[PDB]
Homo-oligomer: A and B are copies of this chain.
Amino acid sequence: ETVSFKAGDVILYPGVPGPRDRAYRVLEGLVRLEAVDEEGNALTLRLVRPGGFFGEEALFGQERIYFAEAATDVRLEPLPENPDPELLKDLAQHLSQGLAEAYRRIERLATQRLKNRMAAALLELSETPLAHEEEGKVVLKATHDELAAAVGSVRETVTKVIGELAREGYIRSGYGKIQLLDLKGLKELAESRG
């Protein structure tokens, strides 16, 4: 069986999973897992690309501490309540990869300057359906508030970092989009603590 969601639609809500809640495997599109505070602002916890899994806590009775939102139009595949061996192995493989990527995020938050973390965030997003190319340059669809959620910062600080990256020539910014001009330069920032 398969289920579809339009960009912006809420797929899962935080809390103790309901008895018929299901985990999902992404077939197409991008899913964003995020923590939302009492003021309605978010912190992106993980991006799930095609082939990835989320909502796994429903298989184990574990509390869901995040919202699962459709970043783009998505087509999902609900997992059975009792995944067979091969599906379970694929789930485990992806949870292992996800945990390692979370480790990398922890490393960045603990040791990397915001400007450098933003460069990494921009490159990461450039590998998703939220980006494409215009005039031969990668163009990302992302507002400053979304970028703030991506690097775990606030609008003002992000706006200042984006402005500096723009003035230096790494990117161009406007109309809810970011155009990447110097990919090699951004990669160098992303790989440095700053």
Within 8 A of B (CB), among A86-144: 88-89, 91-93, 95-100, 102-107, 109-111
Within 8 A of B (CB), among A10-48: 33, 35, 43, 45-46
**A124 nearest CB across to chain B (Å):** 14
Given A43-B106, A103-B66, verify A96-B35 contact (CB < 8 Å): no
C-alpha spacing A53/B56, complex, angstroms = 17
B45 touches A106 (CB 8 A): yes
How would you classify the secondary structure of chain A's contact residues: helix, strand, loop or mixed?
A: helix
B59 touches A100 (CB 8 A): no
Does A159 count as interface, using CB distance less than 8 angstroms? no
- Neighbouring B residues of A93 by C-beta, 8 Å: 59-60, 62
A95 touches B106 (CB 8 A): no
B62 touches A96 (CB 8 A): yes
B102 touches A99 (CB 8 A): yes
Does A77 count as interface, using CB distance less than 8 angstroms? no
A62 contacts which of B35, B85, B97 (Cβ < 8 Å)?
A: B97
Q: Size band of the A side of the interface?
A: 35 or more
A102 contacts which of B59, B89, B92, B103 (Cβ < 8 Å)?
A: B103
Does A51 count as interface, using CB distance less than 8 angstroms? no
Interface residues of A (CB under 8 A from B): 33, 35, 43, 45-46, 56-57, 59-60, 62-63, 65-66, 84-85, 88-89, 91-93, 95-100, 102-107, 109-111, 152-153
Known pairs A59-B92, A60-B93, A95-B95; list 19 more (Cβ under 8 Å): A35-B107, A43-B107, A59-B93, A59-B96, A60-B97, A65-B103, A66-B103, A85-B88, A88-B88, A88-B89, A92-B92, A95-B96, A99-B99, A102-B102, A102-B106, A106-B109, A106-B152, A109-B109, A109-B152
